[PDB]
PDB file of C-alpha atoms in Angstrom:
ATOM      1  CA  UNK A   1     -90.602  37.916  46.525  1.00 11.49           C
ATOM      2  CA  UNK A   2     -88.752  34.798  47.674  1.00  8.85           C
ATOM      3  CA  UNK A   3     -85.287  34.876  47.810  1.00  7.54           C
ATOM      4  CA  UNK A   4     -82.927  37.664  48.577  1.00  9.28           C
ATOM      5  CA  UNK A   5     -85.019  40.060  45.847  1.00  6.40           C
ATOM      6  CA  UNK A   6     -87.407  37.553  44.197  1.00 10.57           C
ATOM      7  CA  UNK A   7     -87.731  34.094  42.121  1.00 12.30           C
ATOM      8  CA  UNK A   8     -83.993  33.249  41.498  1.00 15.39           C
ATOM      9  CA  UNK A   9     -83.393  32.544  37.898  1.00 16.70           C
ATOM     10  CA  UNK A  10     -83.987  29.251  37.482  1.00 15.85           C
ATOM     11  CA  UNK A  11     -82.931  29.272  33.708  1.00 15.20           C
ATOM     12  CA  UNK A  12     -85.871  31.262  33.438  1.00 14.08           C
ATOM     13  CA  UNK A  13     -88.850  33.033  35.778  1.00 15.23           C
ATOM     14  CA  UNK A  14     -92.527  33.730  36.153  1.00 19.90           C
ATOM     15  CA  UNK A  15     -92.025  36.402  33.245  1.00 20.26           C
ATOM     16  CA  UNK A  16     -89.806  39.337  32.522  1.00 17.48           C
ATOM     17  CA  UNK A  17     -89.225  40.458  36.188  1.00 13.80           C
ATOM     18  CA  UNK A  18     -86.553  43.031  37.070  1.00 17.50           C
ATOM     19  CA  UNK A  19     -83.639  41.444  38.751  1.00 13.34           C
ATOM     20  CA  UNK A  20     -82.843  42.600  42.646  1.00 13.52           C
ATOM     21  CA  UNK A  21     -81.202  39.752  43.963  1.00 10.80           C
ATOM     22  CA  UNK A  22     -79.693  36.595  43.012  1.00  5.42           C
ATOM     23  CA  UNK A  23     -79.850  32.904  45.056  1.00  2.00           C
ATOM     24  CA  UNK A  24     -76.884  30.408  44.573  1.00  2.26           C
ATOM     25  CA  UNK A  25     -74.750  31.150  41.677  1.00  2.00           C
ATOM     26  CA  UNK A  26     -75.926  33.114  39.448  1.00  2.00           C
ATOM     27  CA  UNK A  27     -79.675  32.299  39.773  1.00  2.00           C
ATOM     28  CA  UNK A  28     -80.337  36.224  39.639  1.00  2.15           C
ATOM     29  CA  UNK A  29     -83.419  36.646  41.472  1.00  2.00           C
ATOM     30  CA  UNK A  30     -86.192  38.269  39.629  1.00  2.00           C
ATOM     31  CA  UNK A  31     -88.693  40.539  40.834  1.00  2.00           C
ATOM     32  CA  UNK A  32     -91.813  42.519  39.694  1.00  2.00           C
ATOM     33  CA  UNK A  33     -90.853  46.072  38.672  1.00  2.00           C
ATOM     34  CA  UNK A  34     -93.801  47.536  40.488  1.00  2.00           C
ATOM     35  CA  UNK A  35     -92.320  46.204  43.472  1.00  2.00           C
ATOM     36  CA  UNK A  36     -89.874  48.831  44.504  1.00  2.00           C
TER      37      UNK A  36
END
């Protein structure tokens, strides 16, 4: 988990992680859903 919640969507992400977050605009950062 990088940013606030995970990988910010860059356009995309590592795979189909649950968003918890989000970086600069809308890069909606994703996260692993067995992650809490």
């Amino acid at each position: 988990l990088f940013c606030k919640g995970g990988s910010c969507h860059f356009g995309g992400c590592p795979s189909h992680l649950i968003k918890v977050g989000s970086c600069f605009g809308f890069r909606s950062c994703c996260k692993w859903p067995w992650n809490a």
